[PDB]
Amino acid sequence: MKNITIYTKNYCPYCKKAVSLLSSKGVDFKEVDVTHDSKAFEDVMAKTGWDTVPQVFVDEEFLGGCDDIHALDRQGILDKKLGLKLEHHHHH
Numbered sequence: 001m002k003n004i005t006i007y008t009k010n011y012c013p014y015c016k017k018a019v020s021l022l023s024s025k026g027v028d029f030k031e032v033d034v035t036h037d038s039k040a041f042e043d044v045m046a047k048t049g050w051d052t053v054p055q056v057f058v059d060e061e062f063l064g065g066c067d068d069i070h071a072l073d074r075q076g077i078l079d080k081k082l083g084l085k086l087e088h089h090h091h092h
């Protein structure tokens with residue numbers, strides 16, 4: 001399955017909204033709370049160049065934060081990035 005991870009901190013309505021969104025999709029994912037783990041969050045920042053939370057990843061891709069995944073969802077793209085169901089229209 002895809003490796004889906006959302007990095008969060010406490011006191012962050014954007015993080016929890018984003019977590020609830022990912023929970024509503026039924027996907028398997030990890031919420032990683034780095035409120036007090038500055039080294040873990042430094043590794044995350046080195047990759048993305050953002051110092052805010054949440055930061056959401058699917059495999060190697062940084063999808064972005066709360067605004068970005070909500071926008072992707074409104075566009076119908078979020079489901080695709082989370083590796084949800086693939087459809088095929090078979091034509092005779």
Ligand SMILES: N[C@@H](CCC(=O)N[C@@H](CSSC[C@H](NC(=O)CC[C@H](N)C(=O)O)C(=O)NCC(=O)O)C(=O)NCC(=O)O)C(=O)O
Pocket residue numbers: 011012013014015051052053054064065066067068
């Ligand atoms: N009370 C505020 C919002 C509620 C709230 O609790 N806000 C948070 C910050 S926004 S939540 C934390 C914030 N996230 C962001 O700003 C990410 C926004 C981006 N647009 C996205 O879509 O993800 C962030 O990372 N900031 C940078 C940093 O912390 O260094 C807070 O004040 N926490 C209190 C505390 O920390 O004690 C309001 O109504 O305006």
